Structures are given as C-alpha cells and as structure tokens.
Amino acid sequence: KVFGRCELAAAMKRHGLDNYRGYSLGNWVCAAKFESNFNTQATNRNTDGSTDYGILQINSRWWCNDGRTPGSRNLCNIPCSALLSSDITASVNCAKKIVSDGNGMNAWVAWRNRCKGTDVQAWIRGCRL
Numbered sequence: 001k002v003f004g005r006c007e008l009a010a011a012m013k014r015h016g017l018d019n020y021r022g023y024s025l026g027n028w029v030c031a032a033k034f035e036s037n038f039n040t041q042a043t044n045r046n047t048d049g050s051t052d053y054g055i056l057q058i059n060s061r062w063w064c065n066d067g068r069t070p071g072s073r074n075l076c077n078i079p080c081s082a083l084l085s086s087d088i089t090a091s092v093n094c095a096k097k098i099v100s101d102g103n104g105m106n107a108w109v110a111w112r113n114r115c116k117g118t119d120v121q122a123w124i125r126g127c128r129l
C-alpha cells in the first residue's frame, strides 16, 4: 500500500507513534517519506546481506527474521514480511523498540541525514489529526 501523507500521519497517531520517545509526528512521517516514499512494500538489500523492510525500512540484521541474514537477530519477534503489510501495526510496534534502543531516531540514517533539524512539522501541515 502506498499511503498518502496525511493518511500515514493519521495511522501513525492511531498507533501511538506521535511524540513517542519525544519524536513528533512530523519526524516519523519525514522518516517514512525518505525511507520508503510511504510504500509499505518497499524492500532494499544492504551491502552486508541484510534487507530493510516496509514503510520505515526496518533492518533484518537486528529486528526481524527473513531466514537469509546470517548471524542476525529478530528483536521485534516478527517475520520481516509482517513489515510489508497494508496494516502498519507491526512496523509501528517494531519502530517503538528501535527508537528506544539508545540512539533515538538516529537509528534511521535517512532521518539523521534528511529530517533531523529540519522543519518536520511541514510533513503534517494541513492534516486533520
């Protein structure tokens, strides 16, 4: 599913992501924009052989099981395929664990490089929330 901008903001809020660990909704929408362009089915293969999955490009080295990332963990206790669903529940619940891991949203390199320090509220501007 490719979400609309406000549609995704609303879904993220519904699932308790808004201001989670102090990160406003615009941060999460911005991260999703640059990680996946709001496409739940986004996948990308990393140089280390791990894969990133879903709207927030969650990585199989630590967070989910895909059966093909040697030496990896599955800390969210989910198949990576769950992160591709039209229902963002699994992605949100896993993101909550990731952002609580110590480095906040810096875990998403694209958030650090493209969202951090910017006017992230622009991402939820106009949205009925």
Ligand SMILES: [Cl-]
Pocket: 024, 025, 026, 027, 120, 121, 122, 124
């Ligand atoms: Cl915001």
Ligand SMILES: [Cl-]
Pocket: 065, 066, 067, 068, 069, 070, 071, 072
């Ligand atoms: Cl594996």
Ligand SMILES: [Cl-]
Pocket: 109, 110, 113, 114
């Ligand atoms: Cl980047």
